[PDB]
Design a protein around this ligand. Structure first.
Ligand SMILES: CCCCCCCCCCC[C@H](O)CC(=O)SCCNC(=O)CCNC(=O)[C@H](O)C(C)(C)COP(=O)(O)O
Ligand code: SF4
Ligand code: SF4
Ligand code: SF4
Ligand code: SF4
Ligand SMILES: [K+]
Ligand SMILES: [Zn+2]
Lengths: 60, 145, 115, 176, 96, 45, 238, 115, 129, 209, 95
């Protein structure tokens, strides 16, 4: 009838520790966010940081 | 500044000079801003620092062996924008990005110069001057440093 | 400027009313926690702790604050009711493993460099 | 461009419906499911014989941290603290002090394996290739304290795996 | 070289040895004090000082990219031998 | 010298199959029912 | 590996060949999985019409990725808002039909096949060039250049000690992650460290809608449903 | 019109057998509800414009597919759905009435995020 | 503005009971509002433009096993930034933390002149270049 | 290309987003305080906190907006501001393939109307902002902690909250229980003061005050 | 760690496909684990002239966000032109 999910049983303070680390230092956090799809998380973070920096990666 | 170099030749190297047990000198890092010379001439009074030669070989030092001994000598460590002049007691002890800075007041003399104690791992590492423009400008004595 | 939005109550009396009914719920609940959660502290030994928790923040006077802790206490009651807190979570209120701390200045001076 | 993954209406010819009823009564796709597993049992298993057989690796593999040293014998580390300043987990503790000779070397270089994330950022940050991630990965310990590496333990690892680590860097330094 | 303190504890290259009246030595009994016998302080000493025939010389530590950043040492003082700040190798002008 | 890096062969890699290849096999429904009924009849006799 | 400014280091020599060899045979494994699950009357009974979600309900519930594609909603960030070089590869999005568990599973298998096609295209179209942006202030210089030149050494030191200062501002960038639309709201302040990095997680929204899906469904259907989301609590709990 | 589509694609969206009439009545309802909004308000102007154009396109084209292409709002059923949504939005915006000037200037530098 | 029977709550704002801070760490601490002094090692003033709030340093002992800097003060590495002094003190009073604000020191405007280096009557004439 | 490293700049998207920003500003002048388009073509609308329910609904229902997916709802805490909490709504329009940002402000003790009625996806998001920051959302179906442990005391994502918290956990055999104790780290977090004292970007140079 | 011909027919028939052509075990087709040294190329900014960082700067050409309205007939507009309906895949329209 009702199914309340009690998430937080694995809540690491990722978004809090990210502030205390530099952008390069915060890169391995996203690899540890979703552990079945990994390079996609790094790709998202890299696209965000590149867009903020107004730079583009080489075509290769 | 740029992000690369177009210098494809051999760099220069300058023999180090000794000026006492407080200021370690690696003169090959000197950019010859002559700020130490002006500080010694005006703020410290003693005219023992200067230049030698011309061109790329003109080196900043004392020529003859003579320690830069003054109550305000260690301040040249602050004056040098590069690592040419460095604090000998602090040499190879800590990195700037890791020391916690706590502002305090010197108690050695009675002027009461404002200082910054940089401590890491609960241990005092060095004393730097803090600008006040009334007490100590931005200098401290050697007994304070 | 001096006048700002309210949370739930529009005066201190209504906030005290909400505090009163929250205490009502907690006081009625306590023995159910003692039995259901298989606690070993006496029933009174939990009711007085509810009283002490209510008396802790008895100094606040901003109404919006009072509604805020009313909601927070309601949430803690909600967790306690449908076994969302566990034995360890409830027992945290009675700080058991914590060694008693001293209050006089002399013992603090004897023990370490702290205020 | 998009495709409809499930938009197939079954044909209602007498043959089609007879085949569907035969599949229902005489379980057909179920027999196909049995046949697939029969085909793979008769196939070769993929298990390797550990520890007599080891899964393949690459020269870039990140494992047990180790401090290298120059061929002369002097340690490569100069206590520039780049590795400590770049570790995402703050697993490196460095204390430096000018040695008797005069060279600046770490009086303490501890790396906490229980806090390390094995990113390899330290080995990139090192300007003298002093700290590396060795090829070793079978270094499990029975007690926690054995995973808190000291300078001496890291130097022992460098002296032990030097033959492997030198070759691994030799086969990868050109990519970096 | 690694030597033995009066208690029995081997001193490391950093001059570390627990005091006799120190409880911490309890950790080392039934175990060993992990120390590195190959002392960098000694190992760099017997490396021969190269007789460089130029006023200044460039050291990269050997191996190019395998070594340390290339630095130039000024060999002008006849009373001392120029020592690379990265690897510790010494150099000296041919008797000036 | 020239630059060297991991590259596809000069003519490019071969074709890569991606479509579903679930093969079709087995007799028709009529044939399956006929075989079952014939087996039943033989057993009955 | 993937880092702001490109990638850490280039591919080891002889890796494209191995990827081609693997992707050549991966189609057989996909077909075997299909033959194992697609037409089975047991799987086609525990996943057909089990966990149906409406199109507007899915859109309002914050769903993304497969749970949109699985319910007729024609949306895919790889095509609608292409990022990187996704506007070059050719692929088809497996739009679902009924929105149940079986339709989403079929969608996932077809996404596997289409991604195999994209892998073939990427292998056949690898261009020459470098691996990181040719800017030593956002990407560390090569180790060979660092040990030889002043500026490379200084930039390497500062990047690995301080980092690249990101201009002040805030952005929300999202990509079609294999789960859904994984995004980041990155808020900088002009320093070398982020001010606030919020993570938009498809798993969060999908698990928020678990109760709406499981209505009248039994416990076994709930076991199927928390699987059709591919729920991962590393991403959910942030 | 033409042959009716079997399904609309997106689930839940049932195929509507009376697209033209439904769209016409919804657009007329939207216009009449807008009539209550004061003319100076931008909501009235913009929504009346959009509804007028789309009503004209609905009236002109009798072909369902050509009308779908012309409206550029996906399939027709999506168009009735969004017309209902706009009608409800206008009904609620009658109550909200955002035509009034800004309620309150933000306190000093709430924006300006170099900090 | 806000038409919901907008109530006067003149008494000063206090969230000391809504932050979760324990008993010990809310009055025995002393925050410090100050503009950080320029690092005399460098010559850049970009780090002396934002006020900062910090907490008093507490005991920092050595870990018996390895020698780390063990501490038991949660509010030791937490330093807030503020655009203006008034906002920082508003935050300090709002959270019920004792403060001691130091005014922002500013370098006094000097009077530079190249000609004074080569003066004819004054003592500012330099003896070297 | 002349800019092989500089990210390409699109100006048509900038014009379209600016036009829609003016459109939204004219549509709802009651709540829209300030609209701006970033250099990387992202539009942000700063509204009064009372306009949370109306503006969103407009962006969800208008034919010219059709933002029917709450991608993300988050908050940013800036202590130096009066109303420190800054709630951010990210919306995506699948019909016009466009992303919009609606950002409002709120202090510690001011409630915000829950957007659960408009965006039913917000229901969980709101709880997170309540749990992480403490912003109370009125008219919410159920507000509760969603990430922190049961009985947690505080809002972790607040800036005035140590990253190590105040309480750690342990197992005590005397009480045979997972007890909570004051935090005491073996190695304290080494706070690195890495910030160049030289101005980085002349463009974002705050005028002196 | 090759099956006999009799077995291969049983595996092939039980599966209905040629398994020997496409196996999931890598025998010798893999790339050699030892490879010749690579020579990585240079980027587009490895020039000895006309390489001033002012032109190549990416971070310093990012202006602050442009405000279009602040609190201190005209045809209705849209965030972007409406999406265009996707077309069926000519490769394989219906699965
Ligand atoms: C331990 C196991 C069970 C699990 C844990 C059981 C305890 C959980 C407690 C949760 C509730 C929370 O601590 C307290 C709250 O929300 S509000 C407290 C009352 N504070 C005020 O209302 C402010 C002003 N105070 C007053 O006005 C006076 O205190 C009084 C109300 C008595 C009126 O007095 P007068 O009339 O004389
Ligand atoms: S202050 Fe330093 S850099 Fe300047 S001249 Fe003196 S030694 Fe050289
Ligand atoms: S830190 Fe500065 S002074 Fe020292 S070597 Fe580098 S550039 Fe020269
Ligand atoms: S590889 Fe290990 S030691 Fe090096 S930075 Fe990463 S976690 Fe730290
Ligand atoms: S980066 Fe290398 S040289 Fe620098 S401190 Fe670490 S190990 Fe030593
Ligand atoms: K200096
Ligand atoms: Zn050397």
């Amino acid at each position: 009838r009702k199914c309340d999910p009690h998430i937080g049983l694995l809540h690491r303070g990722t978004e809090k520790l990210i502030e205390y680390k530099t952008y390069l230092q915060a890169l391995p956090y996203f690899d540890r966010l979703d552990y079945v799809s990994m390079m996609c998380n790094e790709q998202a973070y890299s696209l965000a940081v590149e867009k903020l920096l107004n730079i583009q990666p080489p075509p290769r | 500044g740029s992000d690369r170099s177009r210098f494809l030749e051999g760099k220069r190297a300058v023999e180090d000079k000794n000026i006492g047990p407080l200021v370690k000198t690696i003169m090959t890092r000197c950019i010859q801003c002559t700020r130490c010379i002006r500080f010694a001439s005006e703020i410290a009074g003693v005219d023992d620092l200067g230049t030698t030669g011309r061109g790329n070989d003109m080196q900043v030092g004392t020529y003859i062996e003579k320690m830069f001994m003054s109550e305000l000598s260690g301040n040249i460590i602050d004056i040098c924008p590069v690592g040419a002049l460095t604090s000998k007691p602090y040499a190879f002890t800590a990195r700037p990005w890791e020391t916690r800075k706590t502002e305090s007041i010197d108690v050695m003399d009675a002027v009461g110069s404002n200082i910054v104690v940089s401590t890491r791992t609960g241990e005092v590492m060095r004393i730097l001057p803090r600008m006040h423009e009334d007490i100590n400008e931005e200098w401290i004595s050697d007994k304070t440093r | 400027g001096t006048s700002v939005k309210p949370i739930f109550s529009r005066d201190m009396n209504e906030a005290k009313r909400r505090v009163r009914e929250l205490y009502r719920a907690w006081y009625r609940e306590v023995p159910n926690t003692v039995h259901l959660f298989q606690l070993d502290i006496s029933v009174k030994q939990g009711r007085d702790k509810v009283r002490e928790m209510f008396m802790k923040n008895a100094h606040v006077t901003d109404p919006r604050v009072v509604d805020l802790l009313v909601i927070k206490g309601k949430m803690e009651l909600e967790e306690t009711i449908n076994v969302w807190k566990q034995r360890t979570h409830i027992m945290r209120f009675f700080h058991e493993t914590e060694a008693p701390r001293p209050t006089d200045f002399l013992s603090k001076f004897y023990v370490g460099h702290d205020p | 461009t998009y495709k409809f993954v499930n938009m197939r209406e079954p044909s209602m010819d007498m043959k089609s419906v007879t085949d569907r009823a035969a599949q229902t009564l005489l379980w057909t796709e179920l027999v196909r499911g049995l046949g697939m597993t029969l085909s793979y049992l008769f196939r070769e298993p993929a298990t390797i014989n550990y520890p007599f057989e080891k899964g393949p690796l690459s020269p870039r593999f990140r494992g047990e941290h180790a401090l290298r040293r120059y061929p002369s014998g002097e340690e490569r580390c100069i206590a520039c603290k780049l590795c400590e300043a770049v570790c995402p987990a703050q697993a490196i503790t460095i204390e430096a002090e000018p040695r008797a000779d005069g060279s600046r070397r770490t009086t303490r270089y501890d790396i906490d394996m229980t806090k390390c994330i094995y990113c390899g950022f330290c080995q990139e940050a090192c300007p003298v290739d002093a700290i590396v991630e060795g090829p070793n990965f079978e270094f499990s310990t029975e007690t926690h304290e054995e995973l808190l590496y000291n300078k001496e333990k890291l130097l022992n690892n460098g002296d032990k795996w030097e033959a492997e680590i030198a070759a691994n860097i030799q086969a990868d330094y050109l990519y970096r | 070289g690694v030597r033995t303190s009066p208690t029995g504890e081997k001193v490391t290259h950093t001059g570390q040895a627990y005091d006799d009246g120190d409880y911490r030595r309890v950790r080392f009994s039934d175990r060993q004090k992990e120390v590195n016998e190959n002392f960098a302080i000694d190992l760099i000493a017997e490396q021969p000082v190269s007789e460089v025939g130029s006023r200044v010389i460039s050291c990269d530590g050997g191996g190019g990219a395998l070594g340390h950043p290339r630095v130039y040492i000024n060999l002008d003082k006849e009373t001392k031998t120029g020592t690379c700040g990265y690897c510790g190798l010494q150099f000296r002008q041919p008797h000036h | 010298s020239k630059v060297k890096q991991d590259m596809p062969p000069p003519g490019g890699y071969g074709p890569i199959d991606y479509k579903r290849n679930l093969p079709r096999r087995g007799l028709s429904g009529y044939s399956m029912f006929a075989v079952g009924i014939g087996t039943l009849l033989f057993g009955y006799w | 590996y993937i880092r702001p400014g490109g990638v850490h280091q280039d591919l080891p020599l002889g890796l494209l060949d191995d990827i081609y060899e693997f992707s050549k045979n991966f189609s057989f494994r996909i077909d075997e999985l299909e033959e194992m699950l697609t037409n089975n009357r047991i799987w086609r009974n525990r996943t057909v019409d089990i966990g149906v979600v409406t199109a507007e309900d899915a859109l309002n519930y914050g769903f993304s990725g497969v749970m949109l594609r699985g319910s007729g909603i024609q949306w895919d960030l790889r095509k609608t808002q292409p990022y990187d070089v996704y506007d070059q590869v050719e692929f088809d999005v497996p739009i679902g039909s009924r929105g149940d568990c079986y339709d989403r599973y079929l969608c996932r298998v077809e996404e596997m096949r289409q991604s195999l096609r994209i892998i073939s295209q990427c292998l056949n179209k690898m261009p020459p060039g470098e691996i990181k942006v040719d800017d030593a202030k956002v990407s560390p210089p090569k180790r060979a250049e660092m040990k030889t030149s002043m500026e490379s050494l200084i930039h390497h030191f500062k990047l690995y000690t301080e980092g690249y200062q990101v201009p002040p501002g805030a952005t929300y960038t999202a990509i079609e992650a294999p789960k859904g639309e994984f995004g980041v709201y990155l808020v900088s302040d002009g320093s070398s460290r982020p001010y606030r990095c919020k993570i938009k997680a498809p798993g969060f929204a999908h698990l928020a809608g678990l109760d709406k899906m499981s209505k009248g469904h039994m416990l076994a259907d709930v076991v199927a449903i928390i699987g059709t989301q591919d729920i991962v609590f590393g991403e959910v709990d942030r | 019109a033409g042959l009716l589509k079997k399904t609309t694609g997106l689930v839940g969206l049932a195929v509507c057998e009376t697209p033209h009439e439904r769209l016409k009545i919804l657009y007329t309802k939207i216009l009449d509800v807008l009539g209550q909004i004061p003319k100076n308000a931008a909501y009235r102007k913009y929504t009346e414009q959009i509804t007028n154009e789309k009503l004209g396109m609905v009236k002109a084209e009798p072909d369902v597919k050509k009308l779908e292409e012309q409206l550029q709002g996906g399939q027709i059923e999506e168009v009735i759905l969004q017309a209902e949504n706009e009608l409800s939005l206008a009904r609620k915006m009658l109550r909200w009435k955002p035509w009034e000037p800004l309620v309150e200037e933000p306190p000093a530098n709430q924006w300006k995020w170099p900090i | 503005t806000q038409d919901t029977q907008l109530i006067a709550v003149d008494e000063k704002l206090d969230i000391t009971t809504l932050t979760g801070v324990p008993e010990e760490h809310i009055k025995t601490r002393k925050v410090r509002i100050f503009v950080p002094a320029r690092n005399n090692m460098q010559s850049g003033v970009n780090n002396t433009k934002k006020w900062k709030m910090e907490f008093d340093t507490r005991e920092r002992w050595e870990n018996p096993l390895m020698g780390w800097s063990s501490t038991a003060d949660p509010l030791s590495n937490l330093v807030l930034t503020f655009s203006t002094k008034e906002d920082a003190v508003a935050f300090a009073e709002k959270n019920g933390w004792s403060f001691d604000v130091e005014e922002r020191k500013v370098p006094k405007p000097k009077s530079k002149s190249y000609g004074a280096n080569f003066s004819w009557n004054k003592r500012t004439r330099v003896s070297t270049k | 290309d002349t800019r092989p490293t500089i990210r390409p700049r699109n100006d048509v998207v900038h014009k379209q987003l600016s036009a829609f920003g003016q459109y939204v500003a004219e549509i709802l002048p009651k709540y829209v305080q300030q609209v701006q388009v970033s250099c990387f073509n992202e539009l942000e609308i700063f509204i009064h906190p009372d306009g949370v329910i109306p503006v969103l609904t407009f962006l969800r229902d208008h034919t010219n907006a059709q933002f029917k997916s709450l991608a993300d709802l988050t908050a940013v805490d800036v202590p130096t501001r009066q109303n420190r909490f800054e709630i951010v709504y990210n919306l995506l329009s699948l019909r016009f393939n466009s992303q919009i940002r609606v950002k409002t402000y709120t202090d510690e003790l001011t409630p915000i109307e829950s957007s659960v009625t408009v965006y039913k996806a917000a229901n969980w998001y709101e709880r997170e902002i309540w749990d992480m920051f403490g912003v109370f959302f009125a008219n919410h179906p159920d507000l509760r902690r969603i990430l922190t442990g049961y009985g947690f005391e505080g809002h972790p994502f607040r800036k005035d909250f140590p990253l190590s918290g105040y309480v750690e956990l342990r197992y005590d055999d005397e009480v045979k229980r997972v007890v909570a104790e004051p935090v005491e780290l073996a190695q304290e977090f080494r706070k690195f003061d890495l910030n160049s004292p030289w101005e980085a970007f002349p463009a974002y140079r705050q005028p002196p005050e | 760690a090759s099956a006999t011909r009799v077995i291969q027919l049983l595996r092939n028939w039980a599966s209905g496909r040629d398994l020997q052509a496409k196996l999931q075990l890598r025998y010798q087709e893999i790339s050699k684990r030892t490879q010749p040294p690579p020579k990585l190329p240079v980027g587009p900014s490895h020039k000895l002239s006309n390489n001033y960082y002012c032109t190549r700067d990416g971070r310093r050409e990012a202006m602050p966000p442009s405000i279009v309205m602040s609190s201190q007939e005209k045809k209705a507009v849209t965030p972007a032109p409406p999406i265009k309906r996707w077309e069926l895949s000519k490769d394989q329209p219906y699965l």
